[PDB]
Structures are given as structure tokens and as C-alpha cells.
Symmetry: D2
Subunit: 83 residues, 4 copies
């Protein structure tokens, strides 16, 4: 794209999954200003929910989505695209 | 239904609308949802983004979503059913 | 002139006429100084906010005195880092 | 009377540090405090800031704080006591 957008990626994962947290955070740190913040909810022993606020064009954003959303031990990864 | 469910309500609204932040907060205090928390981004002079994280039976989540969505100044008020 | 990050922790009563407008107006007119806010609705008359702030120690302290002095704020403490 | 209370724990840490993100998350899931939520700012390549919002008695909170305070790679870990 070029068109500048805001989005939320809602994630459910198990933090017991070996190296998952390391991957998700390295992806977000390596993505520059694309990631505004994350809010985390410790649901139970094997479920975390995260809302990851994202900003950029539609293509940068879906790509971030697919990176985080494909990792092993991610149960659920859904984009809400806003503007 | 009769159980525990997690949802994320994603809202974009105009904080220039008279009383709007105050009404959105009160709807949340008054609700028999347990709102776990709300994260807010001041996107610009006319746009705020909130991710409101909710727990409850579907009826109450849905009542929250409609009630927020029915406020003048809300531009976008979309729910992600997670859980 | 050194850029720093800070958390302003606020408790206030949302039933206070116009406190919410004033707080959000301050933050919106503060440019890139506010990163985000996280809100917990404690009970009928208490909200806790965690307001995350970025700038020099002066710009930050001002921001603090601005939110911090509004009528209806019970508590306004700054963590510097 | 019985004394469940609110606190904010503010943490700066190095996400490069070997499995620090997993361990902090793990400490949070395993504690007897109610962690309401964690907000995370990716500050730069070596710095993450978290705001951990907590509810419980002063003992379990102080336990959480000292425990996060003692992981290698955590750089700053101040509690703010609320009510
Ligand atoms: Ni968790
Ligand atoms: Ni705003
Ligand atoms: Ni509130
Ligand atoms: Ni980070």
C-alpha cells in the first residue's frame, strides 16, 4: 500500500510453548514503529490473551499478522482493521 | 451459553463529542460484564482507539457492544469473540 | 534535553463533571508525549489509569501537574525511568 | 478487615535476555495475586517497559515484585501503591 492505517491483532496462545514469547516479542521489536503497544491478560494456566495495537499500511500489517499468527502454540490470531 | 467467555471490543471514537468519554466509561462501570481493562491510543485530534477487554455470557457482551455502538461520536465498534 | 519514559498512575472518580474531557483534552493536545493509557474500573466511583509518557523530565513533570491537579483526582503518582 | 488492594508494578527489562519474557509471564500466571493486566511498550532493541496492574494483599504483591526484581535482565522494578 501507501495508505496509513490502525489495527488490532488479538492473540491467544499458551506461554508454556517453548520459545513462543521470545519469537513474538522479537518480531515486534524488529518491526520498528509498526507496534504501538500490547495488552496482556493471563487467562488461566495455559492461556494468555494479547491485544497488539498496530499501525502502518495494509500490507505491512497483514504481514505482521501472518508472522505472529503462524507461530507454533498460537491458538487464535485475529486482525481487526480500523482506520 | 451459561458460562465464561472472553471478547475484545474495538472502538474508534471522536473525543470532541460532548460527554462521550465519560458516557463510555459509565456504560462500562454500570455493566454486569466484568470489563477486565481498556487500553486507549490518542490517534489524533479527532480519533481515539480503545480496546476493551470483556468477560461474561454472550448476552451481556452483546449488550455492551450495542450500547457503545449506539453512541453519537463512535465511528467503529467491532467485537472479537475470543475465548 | 534527554528523552525519558514515565508512568503516571492516577485514580479518579469518573462521576466528576468534565474530569474525563479535561484529561483526554490534555493528552490529545500533548502531541507524542502520551504513548497510551490503560484503565481499570475499580468500583462505582474509582477508576485507576496508568498513563505512559515519553519526553524530557520537564515536559513530563508539567503533564503530571496538569492531570494531577484536576478536581476529582484522588491520586496522581509519577514513576520516572 | 480483609485487605485486597491495588498496585502498579513498573518494569524495564532487556528482551534479549534468555527467556526473560517467558519467565516474567510464568511468574505472573503462578502468583496468588490477581494480575489484572500487563501493558507493554517496546522501547527499543534492548528495552521493554511493562505496567503490571495487581490486586491482592500486600504480601503477595511484595512477593511478585521481589520475584520479578530478581530476574537477570530486569533493569528497573518499582511498585506504586494505589487505593
Ligand atoms: Ni499470560
Ligand atoms: Ni484519546
Ligand atoms: Ni473506570
Ligand atoms: Ni518489548
Amino acid at each position: 500500500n501507501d495508505e496509513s492505517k490502525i489495527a488490532v491483532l488479538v492473540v491467544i496462545y499458551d506461554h508454556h510453548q517453548r520459545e513462543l514469547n521470545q519469537r513474538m516479542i522479537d518480531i515486534q521489536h524488529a518491526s520498528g514503529t509498526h507496534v504501538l503497544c500490547t495488552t496482556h491478560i493471563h487467562m488461566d494456566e495455559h492461556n494468555c490473551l494479547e491485544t497488539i495495537i498496530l499501525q502502518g499500511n495494509s500490507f505491512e500489517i497483514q504481514r505482521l499478522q501472518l508472522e505472529i499468527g503462524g507461530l507454533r502454540g498460537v491458538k487464535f490470531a485475529k486482525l481487526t482493521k480500523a482506520s
